[PDB]
Amino acid sequence: QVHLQQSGAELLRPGTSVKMSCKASGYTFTNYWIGWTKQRPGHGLEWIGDIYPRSGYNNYNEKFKGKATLTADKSSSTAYMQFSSLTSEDSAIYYCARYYGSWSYYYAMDYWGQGTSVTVSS
Amino acid sequence: DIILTQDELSVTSGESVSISCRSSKSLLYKDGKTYLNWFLQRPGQSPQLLIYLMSTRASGVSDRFSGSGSGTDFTLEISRVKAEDVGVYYCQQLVEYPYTFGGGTKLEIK
Numbered sequence A: 001q002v003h004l005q006q007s008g009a010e011l012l013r014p015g016t017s018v019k020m021s022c023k024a025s026g027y028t029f030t031n032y033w034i035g036w037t038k039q040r041p042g043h044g045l046e047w048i049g050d051i052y053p054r055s056g057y058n059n060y061n062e063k064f065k066g067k068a069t070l071t072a073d074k075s076s077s078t079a080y081m082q083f084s085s086l087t088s089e090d091s092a093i094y095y096c097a098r099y100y101g102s103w104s105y106y107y108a109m110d111y112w113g114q115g116t117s118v119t120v121s122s
Numbered sequence B: 001d002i003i004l005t006q007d008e009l010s011v012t013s014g015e016s017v018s019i020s021c022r023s024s025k026s027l028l029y030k031d032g033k034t035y036l037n038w039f040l041q042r043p044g045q046s047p048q049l050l051i052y053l054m055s056t057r058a059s060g061v062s063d064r065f066s067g068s069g070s071g072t073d074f075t076l077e078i079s080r081v082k083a084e085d086v087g088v089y090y091c092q093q094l095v096e097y098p099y100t101f102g103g104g105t106k107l108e109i110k
Ligand SMILES: C=CC[N+]1([C@H]2C[C@H]3[C@@H]4CC[C@H]5C[C@H](O)[C@@H](N6CCOCC6)C[C@]5(C)[C@H]4CC[C@]3(C)[C@H]2OC(C)=O)CCCC1
Pocket: A052, A055, A056, A057, A103, A104, A105, A106, A107, B029, B035, B094, B095, B096, B097
């Protein structure tokens, strides 16, 4: 069955970087877009960015363009998200998810990871 | 950015309910498609997809769920509400960058 397995909870100091993983199984990783979402209490869901693993094409919500870096390793079917310059506002659950559709068009996140909890504290 | 507005809070089991999502702008794209999605986030779980392109039920989703809309008003209809439908319902648009979500509407059964 389709599965997106995300890495475990992180507790980090302000100004550090984190790199979290999203390992895909049960479908062809290079045929679908992956995107990342941020969920904090009081702020519902926010879109961070998408990547098309086959091509490495990535694009961002302007407000995360400074902060988030998306990559994909085709050989391990793993997507990564790196966050630099962590602040207390980065304390959130982060999801990865696959999009229904193809390469030239997609419609919605159809299979979701379980979320990675990042907590930023001094 | 496109703003999607939902009430924070929405019932007895078996009743019908609907969730409203109001867009600041038309979500119709030049291809005639409306890039509006509905997700359910059950308590302590990841979001799950219900509806895409405003009115297409995703594979494996109960036909109790249906989506409609017109102009800037969108509706998720739920027939015969069940315990498994409890959670937060989010709308989302993919017609313009950045992609944006509604604030979520919480559904509880009494
Ligand atoms: C329906 C409209 C909404 N948007 C469009 C914008 C669309 C993109 C425009 C640029 C394209 C370049 C190239 O041809 C393709 N690349 C695939 C990756 O490898 C490199 C080649 C497809 C490409 C990235 C498109 C994919 C689908 C894109 C995101 C569409 O969005 C969706 C959800 O389908 C427009 C504004 C917001 C996004």
